[PDB]
UniProtKB/Swiss-Prot annotation, chains A, B:
GO terms for biological process: cellular response to amino acid stimulus; cellular response to chemical stress; cellular response to oxidative stress; cellular response to UV; DNA damage response; MAPK cascade; negative regulation of canonical Wnt signaling pathway; negative regulation of insulin receptor signaling pathway. Zn(2+) 1 binds at C23, C26, H61, C64. This is E3 ubiquitin-protein ligase RBX1. The lineage of its organism: Eukaryota, Metazoa, Chordata, Craniata, Vertebrata. It comes from Homo sapiens. The chain holds residues 20 to 108 of 108 of the full protein. Keywords: Acetylation, Cytoplasm, DNA damage, DNA repair, Host-virus interaction, Metal-binding, Nucleus, Phosphoprotein, Transferase, Ubl conjugation pathway, Zinc, Zinc-finger. A zinc finger (RING-type) spans 34-79. The gene is RBX1.
UniProtKB/Swiss-Prot annotation, chain C:
Brain, spermatozoa, and testis (at protein level). Widely expressed. Core component of multiple cullin-RING-based BCR (BTB-CUL3-RBX1) E3 ubiquitin-protein ligase complexes which mediate the ubiquitination and subsequent proteasomal degradation of target proteins. BCR complexes and ARIH1 collaborate in tandem to mediate ubiquitination of target proteins. As a scaffold protein may contribute to catalysis through positioning of the substrate and the ubiquitin-conjugating enzyme. Belongs to the cullin family. The lineage of its organism: Eukaryota, Metazoa, Chordata, Craniata, Vertebrata. It is linked to Pseudohypoaldosteronism 2E: An autosomal dominant disorder characterized by severe hypertension, hyperkalemia, hyperchloremia, hyperchloremic metabolic acidosis, and correction of physiologic abnormalities by thiazide diuretics. Neurodevelopmental disorder with or without autism or seizures: An autosomal dominant disorder manifesting in infancy and characterized by global developmental delay, variably impaired intellectual development, and speech delay. Some patients have seizures, others have autistic features or behavioral abnormalities. Additional variable features include cardiac defects, failure to thrive, or brain imaging anomalies. It comes from the Eukaryota. Neddylated. Attachment of NEDD8 is required for the E3 ubiquitin-protein ligase activity of the BCR complex. Deneddylated via its interaction with the COP9 signalosome (CSN) complex. High-glucose conditions in renal tubular epithelial cells lead to up-regulation of CUL3 expression, significant increase in CUL3-mediated ubiquitination of MRPL12 and dysregulation of mitochondrial biosynthesis. It is found in: Nucleus; Golgi apparatus; Cell projection, Cilium, Flagellum; Cytoplasm, Cytoskeleton, Spindle. This is Cullin-3. The gene is CUL3.
Amino acid sequence: KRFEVKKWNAVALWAWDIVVDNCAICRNHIMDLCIECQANQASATSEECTVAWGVCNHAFHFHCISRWLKTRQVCPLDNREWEFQKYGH
Amino acid sequence: KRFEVKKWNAVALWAWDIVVDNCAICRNHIMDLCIECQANQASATSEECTVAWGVCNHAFHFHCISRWLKTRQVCPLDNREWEFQKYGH
Amino acid sequence: KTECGCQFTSKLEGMFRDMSISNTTMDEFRQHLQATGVSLGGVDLTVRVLTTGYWPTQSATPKCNIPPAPRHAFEIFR
Amino acid sequence: RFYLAKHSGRQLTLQHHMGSADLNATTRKHILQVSTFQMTILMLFNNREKYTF
Ligand SMILES: [Zn+2]
Ligand SMILES: [Zn+2]
Ligand SMILES: [Zn+2]
Ligand SMILES: [Zn+2]
Ligand SMILES: [Zn+2]
Ligand SMILES: [Zn+2]
C-alpha cells in the first residue's frame, strides 16, 4: 500500500452505570423529566431539571440526586461521596 | 539442516523503574546532571554526580538519593531499604 | 489552593488523578497486547482512558467510518 | 512475553556476552558447545555456507 498506519493514540472515554434508559434514583429515563417534574412544563419557572454528573461517572436527574443528598450522600450505585462534576448531558 | 540448536542457557538481566529517560527524584534524565548540578561544569571540583544503583534495581543520580536519604530511607519506588549496589551507569 | 481555596481547584487535582489513571491503563493494555495480539492491527497502540464529567465535553462523540487496522486495534481494546 | 505478562515490571535486556549452548551436529550425531558467541556465525553458516569476514 501507499499509506500504512504505524501508531495510533485514541483516547477512550468510559461511563459507569449512568443507564441512558433509566435514572437509577427515580426510574424514568436519563432525560425526559423526573418523578418530581412529570409534565415538561408543570410551571417550569426558570430553575432547571437536567442531568447531574458525579466524579464516579454516575448520572441522575439533578433534582433526584439533590433530594437524595438528604436521605444519604455516598452515590447510591457505589460507596464514593457523590460529587457534581457536571451539569447537563 | 547440518547444525541444530538443542539447548540454550541465556541469562536474562532485568531492570526496575530506573526510567532511563527520567530520574524519579529530580526528573531530568538518568544521566545529564541533576537539579543540584544543572550546568555540566558548575565548578565540578573533582567529587562526582553519576547514577546510583540500589539493590531493588532502581536508579537515580547518586546525589539525588543521597539527598533523599536526609528526607527518608526506604527507596522511593518501594518499601525495601535502599542499598548502594553500584556507582555509575 | 493557597488563594481561591479547596473548591474549583481540587477539580484540577481530580483531573491529574484522571491523567494517572489513563497512563496506567495505557501501559496495562500494551502489556495485555502481549497476551492477546490475535491480529497484527495493534502494532503500536497508545490508548488513553478518561472520565466523562472529568474532561470538557469533547463534542457529540462522532461516529464516522474508522480505518481497519485501527478497527482491529479498537476491537481488541474494547 | 511471559516475563511481561506475568511479572510485568522488569525489562529483559538482550545480550550475548554470557551463557552457553549445546549445538547438536551431525558418522554419528556429536553435540557441540557454543558459549553464546559462535551461535550467530554458525547460524549464518547454516543459512548459507561459504562466508567470510
Ligand atoms: Zn431521576
Ligand atoms: Zn425534576
Ligand atoms: Zn457512583
Ligand atoms: Zn536526579
Ligand atoms: Zn548533582
Ligand atoms: Zn526501589
